[PDB]
Amino acid sequence: IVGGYTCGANTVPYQVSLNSGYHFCGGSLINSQWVVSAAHCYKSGIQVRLGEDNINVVEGNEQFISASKSIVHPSYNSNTLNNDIMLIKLKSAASLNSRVASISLPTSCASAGTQCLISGWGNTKSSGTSYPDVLKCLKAPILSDSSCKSAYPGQITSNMFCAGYLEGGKDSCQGDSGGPVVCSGKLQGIVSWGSGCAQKNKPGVYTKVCNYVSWIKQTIASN
């Protein structure tokens, strides 16, 4: 997250870190046994780290649980990034508490101008690299579809939306992929892609979770 702020420990209790011997992506806990992340975050062996603040120190609110299943959307396309969603089933259920909690799925899509919270452990610089130990947060609005398409001609599908600031300076970044975009207490987005980070006229692009709610529920029920 570029241009964000330190969230505070365990203030985003649905945020997870996906770990393959190092943090590589975020995710969102949607029930005690299931996480939503990006399809491009798939790997064969993932450890989900719940309850994290400082990802480099054992502080005592963590739960480390291996993924048993990581289920990429069958229509995910790695060239266009359409359908960039994955479901992760935990090998055992997380213990839900004030520091480890689920986020609700949406009942409707969000409108332009809705303010959302975006979070992660990704890069905090728009040029070069600086990776945080503690979780970062950004408040950012959803943009109009027309503004989003104008920023990324030919690239925005109906399964994507843009959020952020066209002036630059505030955005998600590498290491934030898969993490949450929460608006009015609902998971509306998944960190997906952008051109650079926090650049002028190049907002973040997020998977539109409201298009997948039925798919998520059916995938969970059958797995």
Partner: peptide, 13 residues
């Protein structure tokens, strides 16, 4: 170069 995985998407190819 567009996806937001650490360290990058292309790095994993």
């Amino acid at each position: 170069i567009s996806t937001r995985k650490y360290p990058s998407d292309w790095e994993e190819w």
